Design an enzyme around this catalytic site. Structure first.
Site, mmCIF file in Angstrom:
data_model
loop_
_atom_site.group_PDB
_atom_site.id
_atom_site.type_symbol
_atom_site.label_atom_id
_atom_site.label_comp_id
_atom_site.label_asym_id
_atom_site.label_seq_id
_atom_site.Cartn_x
_atom_site.Cartn_y
_atom_site.Cartn_z
ATOM 1 C CB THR A 110 42.253 -110.054 83.483
ATOM 2 O OG1 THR A 110 42.545 -108.375 83.684
ATOM 3 C CG2 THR A 110 43.431 -110.504 82.306
ATOM 4 C CE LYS A 169 43.812 -106.933 81.951
ATOM 5 N NZ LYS A 169 44.633 -105.714 82.088
ATOM 6 C CE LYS A 178 45.832 -118.351 87.500
ATOM 7 N NZ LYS A 178 45.409 -119.333 87.699
#
Ligand SMILES: [Cl-]
Ligand SMILES: [Cl-]
Ligand SMILES: [Cl-]
Ligand SMILES: [Cl-]
Lengths: 292, 292, 292, 292
Positions: free
Chosen positions: B99, B174, B242
């Site tokens: 990711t 994503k 994050k």
């Protein structure tokens, strides 16, 4: 001529008409009232009796259900002239399934029981479709005996009933549910818009969401319409926004800080300012989309 | 000795170990690398080969998959000494399922194809359980030919694969998915805490949510643990936070205002300040609960 | 003291006790009768009234439901002294949900309506568990007005109601359903035994069946018990066998040749001869297993 | 040019074409053979290679899958001139997924391993639709190492794979599954016809069955077509009947008496005599309906 059960029913808005029609289609005798008379047409055609006021419905029926559009309507129906309270007496049961705050249901409770009646608040989770399908979730509180006696009706109206204790508990549970819903709808809208603005397909995003850990009926049902900028009202945005406010007031009362609900609330206000109050609450995405 | 397919695999964190083990259990020959050696034990016991560096895995394998913990790790594995890039050449395929943000995958893409290799980004929706069950959703972008050739692996790793076009599109999709997730988890947490503080059962609230229009696997799976203040890490909170930041940067880039994501992000920061970064992202509820 | 609806209820066998208890737990006032008195204990503890005879239940209640073990019981309750018929009069409704043949329900109908009453047959699809869960399927026929008035009760007892027209149609539909069931159980049993005798795992066979096009709740629910030779009665084998006979008589009546039902019937007879009549109908597998 | 995995594939009948196309659409390189050449057209258009004989496919491919219409075809492909056996050698794997009896697969096994090859039988549960959707259930037996190496292919072809031990076990399990299916289809057909002949709606019967304990995909999928006398072949009746015979022979071998399977078998024979062999096996209902 004969029936197993009969009920009075006040309020023929989106949810009210769906719920009362469900009862009629399920063998209940129903006597209805609505301030807007034309709303009664479809119920009459299916055998519903009609009275001129909430007072008359109460006088006629031992058990009466109410589904009103907002707290002000719920109170008016009870306290105004020709209202519920003037025909309340021993043996009368009133079940208010309107979405209101605890202070509202508590006020109604005190007045009803003060006149010898019994009171249950029975706010519901689930919109128009569930209401037509009898798939609502009943969040009841108040008189436990009246709750139990009302289960046969709740079993037609919904797929599950919860008894949550004293009056106010149902109201509070309902506001919390709608608060999450409002916040979720906002989170959803932000993603749909970000996909579109970033050069992606919001439709593909929707397919992805519907396959994963966040998949839910709301995303599934609202998503495709939102992506077409279509917001037919199942749950009007102005009501969702009011509910966010009421939830935040409960937060205020209990000193709970809720930044996400608070931000979502302000987004709904912006949507109202865009003239979207009467559309579905999913129209809040227009507040995220707005640019120039 | 013989196999139908073989793959290299870099990264044995929560997702990496689950995914590589799934491949092994499904008849793939797998050659793994991890910076933490002990992580390789379980894979070796199931027949995995092991190399000392990403460079060696690439040299050995035509197709290599990477699943790293964060963008910095993903870049390091590619560009550092003993990294992927030094053994990339014609015929080599690299599939980074980490990711990351678009700028990261684009950087890796340019470097890999610059050395004659082919590159796909294949970030996934779904956590540890889906990873073990091969129920991930693959959000692929980049080299379309390499994507297609990789479908047999993606079919074992996940239940559905999307090809989203040019490099960066997968990364963006994503981040958007995880942003909604982060926001939803916050909305959820606020309701659970409000229920508790208002004198209600957060467990009953959970039952109600699981029956209605918002019902989803995340609420179902995380809810009961959250109500017990138990946050074993499936998706560490520091990584979710994050990701919120990266999503908000994409919003920044495209001038999309996202107040709910922004508020949720700050709540995750508060949770980190409470020392909860290594716990499950569902621990963000502790930021809502904190009082004195 | 007060209730929305009240009903009489005759018969507290496996299905009767489950159904009457469901009504009680759902806010119905219920007045019960059973020839075996001890069966009434659990209902009394949940607030049920009790009468000494079906005649007394009818006299007391406007609407009465009956769930008896077999056609002979259903007739006896109606025609014997102290039976239903002696208190039937205008305004009385009788709903027989027993599993019987058309000739039986027709006989009861003629007698009841002859005395000014109204009659519905409401045989159900679904066993003990569905009965407890209110998940029965109601196969109603007879007086359409009484059917409609009974929907509130049927909505608690089951998840779906069908009105099939004139008396006899419900009986016929029910027999056909049970005939397929009996035949299926036989087909199932033959496969389970063949697997075992052929050196395979009947448990694995079961897993395979549960994953494919034949997967159904009956296989799922009965399979594991059958493989352990455990047949606690949910639907006694002697009743299933009688139903096969009645279905085959309907076939006889309409000149329909049904070799599979006929073979299954004979297998159930063999099971009875093995002394298995009082066990679950799934015990028919013992007839297939028998060897020496 | 490049792929992760490649396979040979023999047989492009209903199941063969569906399965090979699924592999192609999922990134496998596939080299096909069929006796009917035109069948290859659609595969060629999707990138399939083509060989003139099974011998050539085997020579070219390390792993070859076969899906033939019946035991005679399965044997012919292996033993006839230009057949599989002449190019079998060390390193070659043959996976026959045809529906055959144990004696057939055992014969093929002995021949293949005798020439240094490895053999797996992998008959499947599930028809045309599951085959297209990759939802088949694989019932494998034989070489365990070859089974494991083949899992990546089985994971694309189906949703679950079972390893059942020595050669013959897969064949036996498959016959047992199809036997139950054949018997069930007969039970189903008898009920549908009895409903119709008794003055009821076979469509309503179908709705009732689909709601209850017997509900299954086969009833759901075949029922509506059967009620319209429409039998497009997904699983040809002549093949189902042959399978009943083979199951009954296994019963014969193990001294298991199976009256329901035996009766169903004879009904399928009658359907064949009505010229229905090439239609779907659901056409057996025509044997029950026949009158004058
Ligand atoms: Cl009036
Ligand atoms: Cl190495
Ligand atoms: Cl009495
Ligand atoms: Cl060739």
């Amino acid at each position: 001529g004969s029936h197993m059960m009969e009920v009075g029913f006040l309020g023929l808005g989106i949810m009210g008409k769906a719920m009362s029609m469900n009862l009629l289609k399920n063998g209940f005798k129903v006597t209805v009232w609505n301030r807007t008379l034309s709303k009664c047409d479809e119920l009459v055609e299916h055998g519903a009796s009609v009275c001129e006021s909430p007072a008359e419905v109460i006088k006629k029926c031992k058990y009466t259900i109410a589904m009103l559009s907002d707290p002000c309507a719920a109170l008016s129906v009870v306290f105004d002239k020709g209202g519920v309270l003037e025909q309340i007496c021993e043996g009368k049961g009133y079940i208010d399934m309107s979405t209101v705050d605890a202070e509202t249901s508590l006020k109604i409770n005190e007045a009803i029981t003060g006149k010898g009646g019994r009171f249950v608040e029975g706010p519901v989770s689930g919109s128009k479709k569930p209401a037509e399908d009898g798939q609502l979730i009943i969040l009841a509180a108040g008189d436990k005996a009246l709750f139990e006696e009302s289960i046969p009706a709740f079993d037609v109206l919904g797929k599950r009933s919860f008894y949550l204790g004293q009056v106010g508990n149902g109201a509070k549970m309902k506001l919390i549910v709608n608060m999450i819903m409002g916040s979720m709808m906002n989170a959803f809208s932000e993603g749909l818009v970000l996909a579109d603005k970033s050069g992606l397909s919001s439709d593909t995003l929707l397919d992805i969401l519907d396959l994963g850990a966040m998949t839910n009926p709301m995303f599934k049902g609202k998503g495709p319409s939102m992506n077409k900028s279509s917001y037919p009202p199942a749950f009007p945005l102005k009501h969702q926004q009011k509910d966010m406010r009421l939830a935040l007031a409960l937060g205020d009362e209990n000193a709970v800080s809720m930044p996400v609900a608070a931000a979502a609330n302000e987004a709904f206000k912006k949507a109202r300012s865009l003239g979207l109050g009467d559309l579905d609450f999913s129209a809040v995405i227009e507040a995220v989309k707005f640019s120039r």
